[PDB]
Amino acid sequence: MVSKGEELFTGVVPILVELDGDVNGHKFSVSGEGEGDATYGKLTLKFICTTGKLPVPWPTLVTTFVTCFARYPDHMRQHDFFKSAMPEGYVQERTIFFKDDGNYKTRAEVKFEGDTLVNRIELKGIDFKEDGNILGHKLEYNYNSHNVYIMADKQKNGIKANFKIRHNIEDGSVQLADHYQQNTPIGDGPVLLPDNHYLSYQSALSKDPNEKRDHMVLLEFVTAAG
């Protein structure tokens, strides 16, 4: 049988992303739009900084900017927490510790508003070096592939994960961003709590040659595996 959650993702779904951020008192907002195709694990999104110049590097926000679009192959259907929580949705929280620098704390609600899948985020960053790799914009505009290990969090009726993102620094070195994550359903309904598994990610960042606002174009693929 097909679940309500699964059914909401059988075709291409429009996405809206909204973020209000404050990093060391540098306040900013970002809007994003695009589409997700969960059958292929495929996200196509464009983000705009609506407040002017983004005060942090775009790559540092990629993980923050909708895992309900992951491709869960048929044999893993009973392990797809993210879709099972829909349409009421889930809260996705992270702390992201930038090694030798500050940290982001993010809280997002991911849910449907009509036919649009919305990721609404608040981000708070503190303890950054005003001249470091983040506030000093020393990170390359690119992105590495990663596997993320997902575990059930039974107590919380959700999932958790921790994983390392390594951002390439302009001098050939790497800026580690250690991610700690917890997701919990918004509604009171049942969800699917998964066996341990992983998600394989690839992300490509580009620019729209006709766009004059500070922005990022993201093509991201995410597939579940045992």
UniProtKB/Swiss-Prot annotation:
Effect of S200F: In H9; increases fluorescence at 395 nm excitation
Mutagenesis or variant effect for V66L: In EYFP; leads to yellow fluorescence, folds faster and more efficiently at 37 degrees Celsius and has superior solubility and brightness
Entry keyword set: Chromophore, Luminescence, Photoprotein
Subunit-level organization: Monomer.
Gene: GFP
Biotechnology: Green fluorescent protein has been engineered to produce a vast number of variously colored mutants, fusion proteins, and biosensors. Further generation of mutants led to more stable proteins (at 37 degrees Celsius for example) with brighter fluorescence and longer fluorescence lifetimes.
Annotated consequence of substituting Y143F: In Sapphire/H9-40; exhibits a huge Stoke's shift, with an excitation peak at 399 nm and an emission peak at 511 nm. In Azurite; shifts the excitation and emission spectra to shorter wavelengths and increases quantum yields compared to BFP
UniProt key word Coiled coil: no
Tissues where the protein occurs: Photocytes.
A biological process term (GO) from this entry: bioluminescence
Source organism of this protein record: Aequorea victoria (Water jellyfish)
This protein's name: Green fluorescent protein
Region forming the signal peptide: none
Effect of I169V: In EBFP1.2; shifts the excitation and emission spectra to shorter wavelengths and increases quantum yields compared to BFP
Pfam assignment, any one: GFP
Outcome following mutation: I165V: In P9; increases fluorescence at 475 nm excitation. In R10-3; matures to the red-emitting state with excitation and emission maxima at 555 and 585 nm, respectively
Disulphide connectivity of cysteines: none
Outcome recorded upon mutating V191A: In mut1.5; shifts fluorescence lifetime from 3.03 to 2.72 ns
Effect ascribed to mutating V222R: In Azurite; shifts the excitation and emission spectra to shorter wavelengths and increases quantum yields compared to BFP
Effect of Y143A: In Cerulean; leads to improved quantum yield, a higher extinction coefficient and is 2.5-fold brighter than ECFP
UniProt family annotation: Belongs to the GFP family.
SUPFAM superfamilies in the cross-refs: GFP-like
Impact reported for A204V: In EBFP1.2; shifts the excitation and emission spectra to shorter wavelengths and increases quantum yields compared to BFP
Effect listed in the UniProt record for changing N196I: In mut2.1; shifts fluorescence lifetime from 3.03 to 2.50 ns
